[PDB]
Amino acid sequence: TPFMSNMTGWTTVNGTWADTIEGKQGRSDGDSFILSSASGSDFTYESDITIKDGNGRGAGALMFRSDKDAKNGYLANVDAKHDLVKFFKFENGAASVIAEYKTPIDVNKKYHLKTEAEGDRFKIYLDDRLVIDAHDSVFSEGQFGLNVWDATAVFQNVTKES
Ligand SMILES: OC[C@H]1O[C@](O)(CO)[C@@H](O)[C@@H]1O
Ligand code: NA
């Protein structure tokens, strides 16, 4: 098992998801999603994320407090195309952004993305540097997942602690 995670029940919502020696690979034009059967309310959730060459060289994301369809929930991402770390939400099937931090995000560079969620408060860390501290009260609990946007991206050491 080349994909390292402490979570299981990984079930594709859409896009294409496969395990490689670099970890779990997602690939789509636009947004796509894979959900774990694992669920949570307050937690730390993290992954190594690498944007590969291909598609639009866009983004890879943690997803959390997600509904069963990935139509509602929170994401934190690294976006190579836009040079952004975004904290955002889907609500009623569409995305809107809560906070975003500007920094160069390079293709083929491994980033460690960490989210700490506690009640309505979220702290997002990029390679251990705190970059976003935000509030949003829309979702309190749900499934963990992963997302890519206009990208091929690879996720490794995907872990939850609570
Ligand atoms: O940064 C990429 C992300 O940006 C969004 O357009 C939200 O602004 C999402 O659809 C996509 O996953
Ligand atoms: Na970039």
From Swiss-Prot:
It is found in: Secreted. Induction: Induced by low concentrations of fructose, but not by sucrose. Repressed by glucose or high concentrations of fructose. Belongs to the glycosyl hydrolase 32 family. Exo-fructosidase that can hydrolyze both levan and inulin, leading to the production of free fructose. Is also able to hydrolyze sucrose and to a small extent raffinose, but not melezitose, stachylose, cellobiose, maltose, and lactose. Levanase cannot be detected in the wild-type B.subtilis but is mostly secreted into the culture medium by SacL mutants, especially at the end of the exponential growth phase. This is Levanase. The lineage of its organism: Bacteria, Bacillati, Bacillota, Bacilli, Bacillales. The chain holds residues 516 to 677 of 677 of the full protein.
